[PDB]
Coordinates of C-alpha atoms in Angstrom, one line a residue:
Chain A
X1 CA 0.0 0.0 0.0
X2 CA 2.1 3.1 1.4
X3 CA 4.0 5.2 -0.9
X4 CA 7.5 4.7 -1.4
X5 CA 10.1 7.8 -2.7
X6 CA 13.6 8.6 -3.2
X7 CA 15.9 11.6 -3.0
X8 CA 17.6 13.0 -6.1
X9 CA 19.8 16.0 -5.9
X10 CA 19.5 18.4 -8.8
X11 CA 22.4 21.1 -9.8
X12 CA 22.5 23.9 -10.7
X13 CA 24.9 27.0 -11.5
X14 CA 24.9 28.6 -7.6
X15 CA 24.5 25.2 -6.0
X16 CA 22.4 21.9 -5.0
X17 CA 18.7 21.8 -4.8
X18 CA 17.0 18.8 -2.8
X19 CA 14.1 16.6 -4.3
X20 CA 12.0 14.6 -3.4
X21 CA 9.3 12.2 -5.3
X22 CA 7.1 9.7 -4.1
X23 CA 5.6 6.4 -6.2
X24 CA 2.9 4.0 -5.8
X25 CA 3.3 0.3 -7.1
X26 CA 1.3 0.9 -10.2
X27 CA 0.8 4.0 -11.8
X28 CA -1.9 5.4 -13.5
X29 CA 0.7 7.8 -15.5
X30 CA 3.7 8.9 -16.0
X31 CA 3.0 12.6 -15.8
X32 CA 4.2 13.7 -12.2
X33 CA 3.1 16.4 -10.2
X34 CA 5.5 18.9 -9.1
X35 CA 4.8 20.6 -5.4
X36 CA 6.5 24.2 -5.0
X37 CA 6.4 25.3 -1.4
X38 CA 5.4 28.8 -0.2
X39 CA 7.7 31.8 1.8
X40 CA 8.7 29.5 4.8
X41 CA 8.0 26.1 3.4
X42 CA 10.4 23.2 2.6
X43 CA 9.9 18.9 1.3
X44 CA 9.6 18.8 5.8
X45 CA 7.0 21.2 6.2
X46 CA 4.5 19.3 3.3
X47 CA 4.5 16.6 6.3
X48 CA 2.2 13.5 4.8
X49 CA 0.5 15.8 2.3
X50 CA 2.7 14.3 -0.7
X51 CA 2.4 10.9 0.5
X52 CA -1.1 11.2 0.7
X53 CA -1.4 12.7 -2.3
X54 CA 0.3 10.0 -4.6
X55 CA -1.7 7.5 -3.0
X56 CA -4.6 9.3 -3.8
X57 CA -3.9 10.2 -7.7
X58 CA -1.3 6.5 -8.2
X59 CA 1.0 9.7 -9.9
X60 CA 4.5 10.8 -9.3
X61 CA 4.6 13.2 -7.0
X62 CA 8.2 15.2 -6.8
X63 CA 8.6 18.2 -4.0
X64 CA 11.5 20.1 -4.4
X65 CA 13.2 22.7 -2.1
X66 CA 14.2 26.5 -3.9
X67 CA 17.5 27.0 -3.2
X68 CA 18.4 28.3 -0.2
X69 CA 15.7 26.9 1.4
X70 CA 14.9 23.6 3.6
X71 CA 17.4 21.0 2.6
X72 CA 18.6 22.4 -0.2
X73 CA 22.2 24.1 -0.4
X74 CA 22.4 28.0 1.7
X75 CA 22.5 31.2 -0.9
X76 CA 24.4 34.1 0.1
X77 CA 22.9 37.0 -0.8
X78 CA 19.7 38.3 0.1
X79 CA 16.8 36.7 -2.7
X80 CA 16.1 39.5 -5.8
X81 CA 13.0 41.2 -6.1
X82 CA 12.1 39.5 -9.3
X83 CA 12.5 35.9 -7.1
X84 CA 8.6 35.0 -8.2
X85 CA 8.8 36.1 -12.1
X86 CA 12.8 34.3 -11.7
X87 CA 11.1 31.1 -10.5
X88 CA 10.4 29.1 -13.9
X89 CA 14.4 30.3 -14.8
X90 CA 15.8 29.2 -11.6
X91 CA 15.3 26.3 -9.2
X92 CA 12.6 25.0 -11.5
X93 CA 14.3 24.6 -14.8
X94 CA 17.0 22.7 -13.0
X95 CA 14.7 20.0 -11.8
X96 CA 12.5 20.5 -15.6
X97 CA 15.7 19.6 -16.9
X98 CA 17.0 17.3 -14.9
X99 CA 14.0 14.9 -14.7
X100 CA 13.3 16.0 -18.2
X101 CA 9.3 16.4 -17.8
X102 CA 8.2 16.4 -21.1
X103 CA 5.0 16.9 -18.8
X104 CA 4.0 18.0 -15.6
X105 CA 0.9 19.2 -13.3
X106 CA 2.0 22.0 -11.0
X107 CA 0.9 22.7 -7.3
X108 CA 2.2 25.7 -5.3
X109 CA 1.0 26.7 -1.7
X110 CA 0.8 30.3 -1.1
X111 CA 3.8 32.6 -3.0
X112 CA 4.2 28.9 -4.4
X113 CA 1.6 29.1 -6.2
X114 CA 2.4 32.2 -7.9
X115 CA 5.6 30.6 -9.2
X116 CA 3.1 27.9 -9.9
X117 CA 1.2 29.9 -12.1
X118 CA 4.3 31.5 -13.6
X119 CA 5.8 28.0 -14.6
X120 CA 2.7 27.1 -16.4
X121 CA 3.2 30.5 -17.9
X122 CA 6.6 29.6 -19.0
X123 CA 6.0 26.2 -19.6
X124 CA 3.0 26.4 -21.9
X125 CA 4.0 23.4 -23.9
X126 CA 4.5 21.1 -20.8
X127 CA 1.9 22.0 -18.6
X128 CA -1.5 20.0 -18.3
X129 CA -2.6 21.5 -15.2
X130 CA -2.3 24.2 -12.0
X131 CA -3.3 24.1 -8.6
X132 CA -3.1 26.8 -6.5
X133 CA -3.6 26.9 -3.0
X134 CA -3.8 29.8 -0.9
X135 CA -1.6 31.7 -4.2
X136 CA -1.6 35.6 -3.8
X137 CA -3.2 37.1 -6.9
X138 CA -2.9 41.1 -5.8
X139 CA -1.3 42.6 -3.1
X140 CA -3.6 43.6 -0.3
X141 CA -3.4 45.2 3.1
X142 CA -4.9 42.0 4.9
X143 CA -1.5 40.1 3.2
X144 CA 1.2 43.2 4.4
X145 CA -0.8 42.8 8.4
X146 CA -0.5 39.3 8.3
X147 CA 3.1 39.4 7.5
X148 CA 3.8 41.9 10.0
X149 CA 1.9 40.3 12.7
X150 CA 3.8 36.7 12.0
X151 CA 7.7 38.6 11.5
X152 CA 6.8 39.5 15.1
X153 CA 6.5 36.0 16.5
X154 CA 9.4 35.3 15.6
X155 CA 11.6 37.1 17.8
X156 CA 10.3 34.9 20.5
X157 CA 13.4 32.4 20.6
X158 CA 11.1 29.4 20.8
X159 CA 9.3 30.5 17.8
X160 CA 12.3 31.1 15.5
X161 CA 14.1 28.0 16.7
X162 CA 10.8 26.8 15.0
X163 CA 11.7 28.1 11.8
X164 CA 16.0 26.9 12.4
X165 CA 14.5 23.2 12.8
X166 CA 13.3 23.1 9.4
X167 CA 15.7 25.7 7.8
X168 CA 19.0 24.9 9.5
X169 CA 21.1 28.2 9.7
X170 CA 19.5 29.3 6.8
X171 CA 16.3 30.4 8.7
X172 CA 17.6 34.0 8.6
X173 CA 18.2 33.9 5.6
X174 CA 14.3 32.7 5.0
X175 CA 12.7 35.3 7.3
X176 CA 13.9 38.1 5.9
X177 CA 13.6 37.0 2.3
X178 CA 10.2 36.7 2.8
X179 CA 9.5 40.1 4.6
X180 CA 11.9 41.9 2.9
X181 CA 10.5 41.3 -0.4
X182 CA 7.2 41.3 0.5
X183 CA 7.1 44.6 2.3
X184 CA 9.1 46.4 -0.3
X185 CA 8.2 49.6 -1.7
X186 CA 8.2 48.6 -5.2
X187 CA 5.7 45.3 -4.1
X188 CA 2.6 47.8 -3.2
X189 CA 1.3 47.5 -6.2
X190 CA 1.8 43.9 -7.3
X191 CA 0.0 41.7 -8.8
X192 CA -0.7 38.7 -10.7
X193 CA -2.5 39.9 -13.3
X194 CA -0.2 39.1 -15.9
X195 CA 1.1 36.1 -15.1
X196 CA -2.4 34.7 -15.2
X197 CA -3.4 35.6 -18.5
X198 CA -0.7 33.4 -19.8
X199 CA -2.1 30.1 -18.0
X200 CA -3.5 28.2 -20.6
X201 CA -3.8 24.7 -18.7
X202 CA -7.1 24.3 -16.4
X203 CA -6.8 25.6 -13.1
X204 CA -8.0 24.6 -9.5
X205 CA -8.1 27.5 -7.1
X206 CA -7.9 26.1 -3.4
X207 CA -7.7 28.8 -0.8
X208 CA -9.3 28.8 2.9
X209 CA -12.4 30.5 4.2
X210 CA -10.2 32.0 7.1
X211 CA -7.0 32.8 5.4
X212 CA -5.2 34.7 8.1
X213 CA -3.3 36.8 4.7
X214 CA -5.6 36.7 1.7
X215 CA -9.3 38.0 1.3
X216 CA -11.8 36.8 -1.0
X217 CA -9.6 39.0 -3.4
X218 CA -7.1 36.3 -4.0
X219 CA -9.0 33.1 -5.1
X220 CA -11.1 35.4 -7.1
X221 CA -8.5 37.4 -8.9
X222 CA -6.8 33.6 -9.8
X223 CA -9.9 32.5 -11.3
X224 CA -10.2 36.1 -13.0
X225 CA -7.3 36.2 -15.0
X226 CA -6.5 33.0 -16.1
X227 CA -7.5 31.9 -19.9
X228 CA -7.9 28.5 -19.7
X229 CA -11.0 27.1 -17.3
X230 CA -10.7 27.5 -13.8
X231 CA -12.7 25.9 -10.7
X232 CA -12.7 27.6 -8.0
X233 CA -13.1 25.6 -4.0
X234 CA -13.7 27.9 -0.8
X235 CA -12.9 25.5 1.9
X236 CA -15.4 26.1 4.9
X237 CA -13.4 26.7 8.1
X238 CA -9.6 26.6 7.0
X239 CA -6.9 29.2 7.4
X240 CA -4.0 29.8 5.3
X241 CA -2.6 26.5 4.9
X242 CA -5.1 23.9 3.7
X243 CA -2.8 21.4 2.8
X244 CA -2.0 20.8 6.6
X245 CA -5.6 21.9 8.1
X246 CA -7.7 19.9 6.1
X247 CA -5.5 17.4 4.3
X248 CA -7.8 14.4 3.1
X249 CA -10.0 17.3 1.7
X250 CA -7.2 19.2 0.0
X251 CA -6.2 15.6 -1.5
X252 CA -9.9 14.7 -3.2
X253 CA -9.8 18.0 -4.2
X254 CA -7.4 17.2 -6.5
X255 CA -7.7 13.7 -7.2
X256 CA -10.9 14.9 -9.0
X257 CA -9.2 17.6 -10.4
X258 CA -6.5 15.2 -12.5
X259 CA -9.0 12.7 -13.0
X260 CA -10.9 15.5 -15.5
X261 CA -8.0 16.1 -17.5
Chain B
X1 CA -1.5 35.4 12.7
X2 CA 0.6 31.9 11.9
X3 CA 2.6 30.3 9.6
X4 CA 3.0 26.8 7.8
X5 CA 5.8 26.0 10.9
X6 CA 2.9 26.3 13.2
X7 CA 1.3 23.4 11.5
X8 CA 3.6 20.4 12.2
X9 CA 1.4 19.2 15.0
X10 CA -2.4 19.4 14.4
X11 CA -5.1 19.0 17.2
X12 CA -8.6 18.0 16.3
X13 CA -11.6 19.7 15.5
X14 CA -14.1 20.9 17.0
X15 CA -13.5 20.9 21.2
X16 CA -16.2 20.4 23.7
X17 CA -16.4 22.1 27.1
X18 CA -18.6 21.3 30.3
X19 CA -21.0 24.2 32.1
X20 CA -23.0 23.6 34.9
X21 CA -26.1 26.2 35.4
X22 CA -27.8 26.4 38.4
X23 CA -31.8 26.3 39.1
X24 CA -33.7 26.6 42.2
X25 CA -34.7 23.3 41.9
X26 CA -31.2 21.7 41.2
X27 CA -28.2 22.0 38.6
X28 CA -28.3 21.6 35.0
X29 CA -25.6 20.1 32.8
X30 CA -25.0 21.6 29.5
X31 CA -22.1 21.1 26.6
X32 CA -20.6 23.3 24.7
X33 CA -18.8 22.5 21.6
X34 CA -16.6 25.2 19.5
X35 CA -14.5 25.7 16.6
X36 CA -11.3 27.7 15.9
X37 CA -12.8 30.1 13.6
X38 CA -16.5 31.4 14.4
X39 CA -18.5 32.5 11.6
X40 CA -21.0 34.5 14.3
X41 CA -20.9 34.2 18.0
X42 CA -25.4 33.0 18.1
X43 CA -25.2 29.9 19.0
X44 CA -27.4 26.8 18.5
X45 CA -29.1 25.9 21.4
X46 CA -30.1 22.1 21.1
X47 CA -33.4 20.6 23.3
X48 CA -33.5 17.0 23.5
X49 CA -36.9 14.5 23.3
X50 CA -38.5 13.0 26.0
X51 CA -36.2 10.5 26.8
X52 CA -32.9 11.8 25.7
X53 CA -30.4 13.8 26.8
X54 CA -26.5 14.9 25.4
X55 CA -25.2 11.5 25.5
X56 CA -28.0 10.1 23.3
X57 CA -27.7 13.2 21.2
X58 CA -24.6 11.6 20.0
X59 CA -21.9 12.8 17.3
X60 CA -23.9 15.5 15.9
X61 CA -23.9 18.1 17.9
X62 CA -19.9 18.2 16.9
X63 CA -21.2 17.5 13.5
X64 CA -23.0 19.9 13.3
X65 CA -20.7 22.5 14.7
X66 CA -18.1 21.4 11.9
X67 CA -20.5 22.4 9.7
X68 CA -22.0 25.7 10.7
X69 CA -18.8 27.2 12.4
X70 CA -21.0 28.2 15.0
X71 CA -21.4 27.3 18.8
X72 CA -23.8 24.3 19.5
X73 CA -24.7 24.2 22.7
X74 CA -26.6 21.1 24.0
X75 CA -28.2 20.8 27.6
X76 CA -30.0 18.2 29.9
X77 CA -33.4 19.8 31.3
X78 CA -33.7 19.4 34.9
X79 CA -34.3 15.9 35.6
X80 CA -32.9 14.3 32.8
X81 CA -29.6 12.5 31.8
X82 CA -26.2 14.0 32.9
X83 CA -28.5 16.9 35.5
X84 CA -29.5 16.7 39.3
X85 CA -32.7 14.4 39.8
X86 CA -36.2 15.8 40.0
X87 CA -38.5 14.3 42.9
X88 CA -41.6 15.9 41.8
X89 CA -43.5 14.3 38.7
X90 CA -43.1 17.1 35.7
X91 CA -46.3 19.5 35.6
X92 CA -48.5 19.2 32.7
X93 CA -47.6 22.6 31.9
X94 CA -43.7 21.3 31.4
X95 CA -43.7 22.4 27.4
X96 CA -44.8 25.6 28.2
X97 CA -43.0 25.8 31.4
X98 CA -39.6 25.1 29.3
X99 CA -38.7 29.0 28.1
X100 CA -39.1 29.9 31.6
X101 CA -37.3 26.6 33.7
X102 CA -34.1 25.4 32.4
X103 CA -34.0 27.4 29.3
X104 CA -33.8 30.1 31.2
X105 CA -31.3 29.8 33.8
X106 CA -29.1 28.6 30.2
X107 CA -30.5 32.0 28.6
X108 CA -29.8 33.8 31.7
X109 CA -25.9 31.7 32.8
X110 CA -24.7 32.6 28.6
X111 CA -26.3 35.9 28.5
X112 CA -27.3 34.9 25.3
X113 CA -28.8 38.1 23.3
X114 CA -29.2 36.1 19.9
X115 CA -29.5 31.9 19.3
X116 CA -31.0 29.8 17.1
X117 CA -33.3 27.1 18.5
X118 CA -33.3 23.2 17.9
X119 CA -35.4 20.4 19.4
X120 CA -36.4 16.9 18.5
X121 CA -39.6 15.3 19.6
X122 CA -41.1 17.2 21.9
X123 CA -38.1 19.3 22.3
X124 CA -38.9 20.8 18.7
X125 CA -42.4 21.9 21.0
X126 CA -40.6 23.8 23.5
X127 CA -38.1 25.3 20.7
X128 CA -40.8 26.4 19.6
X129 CA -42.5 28.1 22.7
X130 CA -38.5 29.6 23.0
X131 CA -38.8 31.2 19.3
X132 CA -41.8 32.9 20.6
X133 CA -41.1 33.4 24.5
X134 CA -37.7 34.9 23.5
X135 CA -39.3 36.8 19.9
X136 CA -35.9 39.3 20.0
X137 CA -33.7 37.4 21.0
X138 CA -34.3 33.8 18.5
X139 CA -33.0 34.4 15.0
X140 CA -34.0 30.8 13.6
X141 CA -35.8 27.7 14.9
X142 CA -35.4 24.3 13.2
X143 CA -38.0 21.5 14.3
X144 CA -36.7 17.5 14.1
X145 CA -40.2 15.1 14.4
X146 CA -42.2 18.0 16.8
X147 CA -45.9 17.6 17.4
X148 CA -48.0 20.1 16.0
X149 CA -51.1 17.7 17.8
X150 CA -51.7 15.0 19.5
X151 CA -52.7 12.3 17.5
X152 CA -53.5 8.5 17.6
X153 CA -50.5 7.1 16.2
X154 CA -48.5 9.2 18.8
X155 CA -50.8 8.2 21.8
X156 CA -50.3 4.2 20.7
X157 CA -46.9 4.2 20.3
X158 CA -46.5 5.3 23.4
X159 CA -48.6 2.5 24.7
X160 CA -46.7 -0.1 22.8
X161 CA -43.6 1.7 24.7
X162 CA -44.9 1.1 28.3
X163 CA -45.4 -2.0 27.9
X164 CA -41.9 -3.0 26.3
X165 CA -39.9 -0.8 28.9
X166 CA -41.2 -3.8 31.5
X167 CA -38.5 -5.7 29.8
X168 CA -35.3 -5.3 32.0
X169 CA -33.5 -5.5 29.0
X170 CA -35.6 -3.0 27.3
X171 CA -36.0 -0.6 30.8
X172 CA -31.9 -1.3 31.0
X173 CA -31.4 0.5 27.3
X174 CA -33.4 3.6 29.3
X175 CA -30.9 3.3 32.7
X176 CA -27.5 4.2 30.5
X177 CA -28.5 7.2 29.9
X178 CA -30.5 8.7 32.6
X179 CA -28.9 6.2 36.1
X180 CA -31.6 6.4 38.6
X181 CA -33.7 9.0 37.4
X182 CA -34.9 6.4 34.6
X183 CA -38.0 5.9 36.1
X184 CA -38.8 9.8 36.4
X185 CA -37.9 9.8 33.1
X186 CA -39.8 7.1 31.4
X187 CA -43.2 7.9 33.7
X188 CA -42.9 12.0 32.9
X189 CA -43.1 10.9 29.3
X190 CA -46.3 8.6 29.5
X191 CA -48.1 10.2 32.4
X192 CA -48.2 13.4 30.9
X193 CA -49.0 12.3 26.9
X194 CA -51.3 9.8 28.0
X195 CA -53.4 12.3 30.5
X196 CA -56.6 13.8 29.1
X197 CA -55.2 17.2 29.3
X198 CA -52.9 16.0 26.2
X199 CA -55.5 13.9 23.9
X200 CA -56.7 17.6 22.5
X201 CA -53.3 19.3 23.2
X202 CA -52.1 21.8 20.2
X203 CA -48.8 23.2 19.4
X204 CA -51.2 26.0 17.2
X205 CA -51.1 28.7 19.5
X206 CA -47.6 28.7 20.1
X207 CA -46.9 28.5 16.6
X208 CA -48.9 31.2 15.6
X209 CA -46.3 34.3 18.1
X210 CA -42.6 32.2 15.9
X211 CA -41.8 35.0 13.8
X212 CA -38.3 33.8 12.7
X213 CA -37.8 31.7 10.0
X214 CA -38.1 27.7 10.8
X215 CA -37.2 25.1 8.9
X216 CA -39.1 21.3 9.8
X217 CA -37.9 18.1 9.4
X218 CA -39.7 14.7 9.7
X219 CA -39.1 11.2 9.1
X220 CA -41.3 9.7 6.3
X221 CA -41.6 6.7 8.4
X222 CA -41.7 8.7 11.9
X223 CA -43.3 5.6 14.0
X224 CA -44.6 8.3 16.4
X225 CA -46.6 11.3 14.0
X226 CA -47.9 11.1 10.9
X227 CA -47.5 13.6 8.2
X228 CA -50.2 16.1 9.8
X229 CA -47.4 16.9 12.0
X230 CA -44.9 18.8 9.8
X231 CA -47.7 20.2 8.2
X232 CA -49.0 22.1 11.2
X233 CA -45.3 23.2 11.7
X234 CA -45.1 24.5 8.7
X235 CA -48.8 26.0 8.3
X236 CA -49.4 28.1 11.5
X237 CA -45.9 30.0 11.8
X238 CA -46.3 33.1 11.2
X239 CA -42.4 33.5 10.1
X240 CA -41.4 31.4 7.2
X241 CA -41.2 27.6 6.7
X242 CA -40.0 25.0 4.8
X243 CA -40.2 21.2 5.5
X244 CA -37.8 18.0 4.6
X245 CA -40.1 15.3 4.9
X246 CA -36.6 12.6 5.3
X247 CA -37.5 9.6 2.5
X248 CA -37.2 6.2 4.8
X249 CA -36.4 8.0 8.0
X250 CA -38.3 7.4 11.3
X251 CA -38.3 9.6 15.0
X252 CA -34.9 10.2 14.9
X253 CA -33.3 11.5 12.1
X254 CA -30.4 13.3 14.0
X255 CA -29.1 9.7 14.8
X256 CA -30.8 7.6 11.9
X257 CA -29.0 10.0 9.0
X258 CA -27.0 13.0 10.5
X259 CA -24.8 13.7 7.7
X260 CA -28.4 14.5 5.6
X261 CA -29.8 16.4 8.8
X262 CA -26.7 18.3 9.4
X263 CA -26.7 19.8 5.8
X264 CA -30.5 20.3 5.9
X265 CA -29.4 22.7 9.1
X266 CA -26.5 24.0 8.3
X267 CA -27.9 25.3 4.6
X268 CA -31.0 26.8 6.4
X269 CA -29.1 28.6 9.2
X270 CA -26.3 29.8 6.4
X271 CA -29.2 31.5 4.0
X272 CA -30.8 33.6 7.4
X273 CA -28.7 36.4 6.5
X274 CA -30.2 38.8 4.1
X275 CA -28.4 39.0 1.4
X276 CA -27.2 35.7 0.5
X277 CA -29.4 33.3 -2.1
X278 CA -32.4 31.7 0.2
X279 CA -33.1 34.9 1.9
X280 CA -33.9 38.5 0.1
X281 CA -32.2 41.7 0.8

């Protein structure tokens, strides 16, 4: 029954990215689905949500930490404002090209899932489907409080040594990445607008009735811009990270989602 | 605010806390179940049936919860299951009596401003004296196999039902739930129903001051009440009504399909607000 996977490390010009990908014993295809991780996320932090997963759908499933991040090799300098448009030029088309998908079905949580939608962008040829879940359309007050609120946290030592458990000494490296960037200047008016409007694939838009950063703005703007077809799922009762609150749901979600392509 | 690295350990969904409310005549248990995220802070006050209680309510009150992210609040009436025992036999006035007995000291212990009202069996007929009693206060009423009358069938089941609970296995099934006060329990169901001052007994009157919306839901096969039943519900509230006659489902749907009577609920308490599809603006 259970899953099996493997590790694979992939390369790349400023240094090793970590991958994981999980199988069942028979497949129902060979086109895998490929998990990009939000602001703070890593393989770790996806817990038994890709497991679950590839039991669910009998497909590949291959998570994959950014550099920089989770167990992947530690990047010096601080991350470039263009680190979501960069995204289908970077981490990404080092795994594309190393496990050579012809093919893929791509899932991103939260500023994941903006890379998400930029890789099906980019990869217009490849991609048979997105999945977003929790993904930031527009930038919105509720999303700049939320990341204030939760930078504060962290200077409790208990709560950081949360983040250095899964991060390693990279975690400050992670935390301010993620507000730095975020809480720039130049990101007050950003959106996802274009991006969207060059997703040609169908999309499913996942994202929680009480997401503690993104408004009814978000799923909607998603399911706005995109050109191909897009179905949309409000999840009744769940906060910014579905994959974790509501996990079987969040998995027949998009079970159902592959099965109609 | 948190983050994904808060969500390596998970706890489950929806909690449950104990409240004792006090009476003059004794000390009434209630439960309280809760989710993280409220939609509003009314809760759903639940009244059980003449021989039930919070244990025999079973999973649905946290079904139900799940599903509305509201507060469901369930309670034993004085007397009853999991609260202090009565001595006195229950006054024939104990439907109308309810807004005013333990109802009230709950009203009164949770302050509560707003709720919306639930009851099965004859719990559905004090729910229903609560929508009216309480006119400002009850936002929505929802009715599980209520009485509107009496009626034959009700009055022989009943019968039927005395004579079976002689069984000590049958009487046992009643002790689980209630301990000692079985007895108190089982004879304040027949000795009122079956009393003269019930055979022309109508919920009517009361029906006739529930100005909130009320939604009424009845087995097809109820053993106890025939169709007449949801009918009066439905006819003589002066708020709206709609009805869910349950295909194959007897007295207690709550425990016979919850699943189907938790999204009958949760759907009707959902479109109260004006403004959303099911209720105008």
């Amino acid at each position: 029954p259970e899953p099996i996977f493997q590790d694979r490390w992939v390369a790349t010009p400023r240094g090793r990215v970590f991958t994981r990908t999980w199988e069942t014993s028979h497949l129902r295809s060979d086109v895998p689905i490929v998990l990009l991780h939000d602001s703070l996320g890593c393989v770790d932090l996806w817990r038994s949500f890709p497991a679950a997963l590839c039991a669910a759908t009998q497909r590949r499933v291959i998570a994959y930490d950014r550099l920089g991040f989770g167990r992947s090799d530690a990047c010096l300098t601080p991350p470039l404002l263009s680190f979501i448009d960069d995204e289908p030029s970077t981490s990404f088309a080092a795994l594309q090209s190393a496990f050579q998908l012809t093919h893929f079905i791509a899932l991103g949580h939260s500023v994941g899932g903006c890379m998400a939608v930029h890789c099906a962008g980019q990869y217009v040829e490849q991609c048979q489907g997105l999945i977003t879940i929790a993904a930031q359309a527009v930038n919105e007050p509720r999303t700049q409080q939320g990341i204030e609120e939760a930078r504060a946290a962290f200077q409790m030592p208990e709560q950081f040594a949360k983040l250095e458990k899964y991060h390693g000494n990279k975690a400050r490296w992670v935390l301010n990445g993620w507000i730095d960037t975020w809480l720039h200047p130049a990101f007050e008016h950003w959106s996802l607008t274009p991006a969207l409007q060059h997703v040609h694939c169908p999309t499913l838009v996942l994202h929680g009735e009480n997401d503690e950063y993104g408004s009814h703005r978000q799923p909607e703007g998603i399911a706005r811009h995109t050109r191909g077809p897009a179905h949309t799922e409000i999840l009744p009762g769940v906060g910014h990270v579905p994959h974790r609150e509501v996990e079987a749901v969040v998995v027949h979600y998009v079970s159902e989602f592959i099965e109609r392509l």
